[PDB]
Amino acid sequence: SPIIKLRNFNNAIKYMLIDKYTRPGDVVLELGCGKGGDLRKYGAAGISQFIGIDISNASIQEAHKRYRSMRNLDYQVVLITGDCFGESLGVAVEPFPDCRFPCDIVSTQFCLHYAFETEEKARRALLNVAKSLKIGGHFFGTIPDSEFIRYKLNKFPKEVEKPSWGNSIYRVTFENNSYQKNDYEFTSPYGQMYTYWLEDAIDNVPEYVVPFETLRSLADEYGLELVSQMPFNKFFVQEIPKWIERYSPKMREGLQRSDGRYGVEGDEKEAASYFFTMFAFRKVKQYIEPESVKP
Ligand SMILES: Nc1nc2c(ncn2[C@@H]2O[C@H](COP(=O)(O)OP(=O)(O)OP(=O)(O)O)[C@@H](O)[C@H]2O)c(=O)[nH]1
Ligand SMILES: Nc1ncnc2c1ncn2[C@@H]1O[C@H](C[C@@H](N)CC[C@H](N)C(=O)O)[C@@H](O)[C@H]1O
């Protein structure tokens, strides 16, 4: 099953990412945490506290009722319904004094692209991330690669109204063709909508492009310096050497091609390894808002 291979691969990527930046005793803030898909991964890292926030009350309840159903829970868990992009994060976390801010890690797995709906939303999300971190703390995540998206968008003539591409397990469909009509450049960093379909996961839901240059430039304004940016395919090849020993025999088989080498082939190759990038930033400065220091 191709979609299974993709799920396996994307979980391997998340392990590689989490265990690279997260250290024993860390406090972790997972924005857009969904249904607690990444709890086991933070366990291996040896964290102290996990703080999950998601806008969907349904998802948080499935997260609560599921943490109980696992062994080796050596860490405190706080799960919160809240909007991490549209609203200040202090709104969401004030009712939860247990939370130990500032924290060591902020993670956004497959969600930061919902924040690029508007400039206002993108700036709050990043200010939320920056406000939350110790200096020396890391913000890491996974988003669609704007460079892969540009590569594909560049291949369409101006005639095509709603540019679309995909394969058997995924499809992207752009709202308009303003990119092509604007000499193969976005009119704006924000609000660049496309509909994403992934087999048995996302059902034609609107997302936004994240021009990596804009993410990097906003992060800098708020005191985050980029320390790594790699597409999944390149990230995996770099990290896989130190993971083969740690994979269980069944985990090994789910990450192997039919020839026995490690990786993805076929439709998964594009849908998983080319379409997504990881990133990691380090907080280097404490942000102070312009014109905010008064007598
Ligand atoms: N573009 C995009 N992809 C997403 C988003 N959310 C999830 N995905 C992708 O959906 C894939 C599969 O999601 P699910 O099938 O729900 O994965 P899961 O709950 O971890 O399931 P198992 O891996 O089987 O335990 C992930 O590996 C991501 O690549 C999103 O908001 N945007
Ligand atoms: N403004 C928002 N604030 C918080 N969560 C949001 C917001 N917008 C979307 N989300 C959530 O982001 C999640 C996106 C999921 N694709 C990711 C879940 C999980 N992190 C994973 O690795 O799959 C969903 O659970 C959404 O409800």
Residue numbers in the entry: 141 to 435
Give the text the authors published on this PDB structure.
The essential enzyme messenger RNA (mRNA) (guanine-N7) methyltransferase catalyzes S-adenosylmethionine (SAM)-dependent conversion of GpppRNA ends to the m7GpppRNA cap structure characteristic of eukaryal mRNAs. The antibiotic sinefungin (SFG) is a SAM analog in which the S-CH3 sulfonium moiety of SAM is replaced by a C-NH2 amine. Available evidence indicates that the antifungal activity of SFG is exerted via inhibition of fungal cap methyltransferase Abd1. Crystal structures of K. lactis and S. cerevisiae Abd1 as binary complexes with SAH or SFG and ternary complexes with GTP•SFG highlight how SFG makes two hydrogen bonds from its C-NH2 amine to the guanine-O6 and -N7 atoms of GTP that account for its higher affinity vis-à-vis SAH and SAM.
To elucidate the role of Tyr416 substitutions in ScAbd1 in conferring SFG resistance, ScAbd1Δ140-K163R-K311R-F387Y-Y416F was purified and co-crystallized in the presence of 1 mM SFG and 3 mM GTP. The structure was refined at a resolution of 2.8 Å with Rwork/Rfree of 18.2/21.7. The crystals contained three ScAbd1 complexes in the asymmetric unit and the tertiary structures of the protomers are very similar to each other (r.m.s.d. between 0.21 and 0.25 Å over 256 Cα positions). SFG engages with the same ensemble of enzymic residues observed in the wild-type ScAbd1•SFG•GTP structure and the C-NH2 amine of SFG makes hydrogen bonds with the O6 (2.9 Å) and N7 (2.5 Å) atoms of GTP, à la the wild-type structure. Whereas the GTP contacts in the SFG-resistant ScAbd1 recapitulate many of those seen in the wild-type ternary complex, there are some noteworthy differences. Second, there is no contact between His253 and guanine-O6 in the variant complex. Third, and most relevant, the Tyr416 phenolic hydroxyl-mediated polar contacts with the guanine-N3 and ribose-O2′ atoms of GTP observed in the wild-type active site are missing in the SFG-resistant variant in which Tyr416 is changed to Phe. In addition, whereas the electron densities for Phe416 and SFG in the resistant variant are well defined, the density for GTP is relatively weak, specifically around the guanosine and ribose moieties, when compared to the GTP density in the wild-type ternary complex.
